[PDB]
Amino acid sequence: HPIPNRPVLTRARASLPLVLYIDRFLGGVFSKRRIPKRTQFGPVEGPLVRGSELKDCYIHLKVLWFELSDETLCNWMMFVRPAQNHLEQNLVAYQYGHHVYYTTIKNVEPKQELKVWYAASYAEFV
């Protein structure tokens, strides 16, 4: 009766809150349970860069900027895809401390993909 070693995941994948999961087939982060309005995730963690040489896999975030390319160097927020209309958006991103956060603007339901875009004031900085 074997019991295998537990698979070790990239930093980005393991730093994910137990409240959420990434869905293999669909792409992106979802909620296991109800996530109420005004729930704050973060901080975004990862390498900082210039805006010069920043990729298109991701939303762009000013703090210098975040390069969210590499799972071994970022945390789970690298997986949170950028919303493309107001229908699908349920997070807003802003700077608060020395840090950047994603905050729910809707009560998010189970099996709904979390999708981010700028809070208006933050949209000014970027």
Please report whether residue 118 resides in a domain: yes
- Distance, in Å, from the CA atom of 43 to the CA atom of 18, rounded to the nearest integer, reads 16
Q: How many degrees, rounded to 5, is the angle at CA 30 between CA 28 and CA 35?
A: 145
Resolution as reported, in Å: 2.5
Q: What is the C-alpha separation between 78 and 58, in angstroms, rounded? A: 7
Q: Is residue 1 part of a domain?
A: no
Residue type, 71: E
Residue 100, domain extent: 9-126
Give exposure, 100-115, as e/b (b: 16+ Cβ within 10 Å).
bbbbbbeebeeeebbb
* Residue 13: strand pairing partners: none
Whole-angstrom Cα distance, residue 50 to residue 54?
7
Interatomic CA distance for residues 70 and 10, integer angstroms: 9
Spatial separation of the C-alpha atoms in residues 71 and 120, rounded to whole Å = 28
> 96 — phi, psi (to 5°)?
-130, -60
DSSP letter assigned to residue 125: H
Tally of structural domains, the chain: 1
User: Cα–Cα distance between 43 and 102 in angstroms, integer?
Assistant: 8
* Cα–Cα distance list, 39 to 7, 55, 106 (Å): 30, 28, 9
Residue 57: give its domain's CATH number: 2.170.270.10
Flag whether 36 is in a domain: yes
**Which H or E element spans position 121?**
helix 120-125
40 lies in some domain: yes
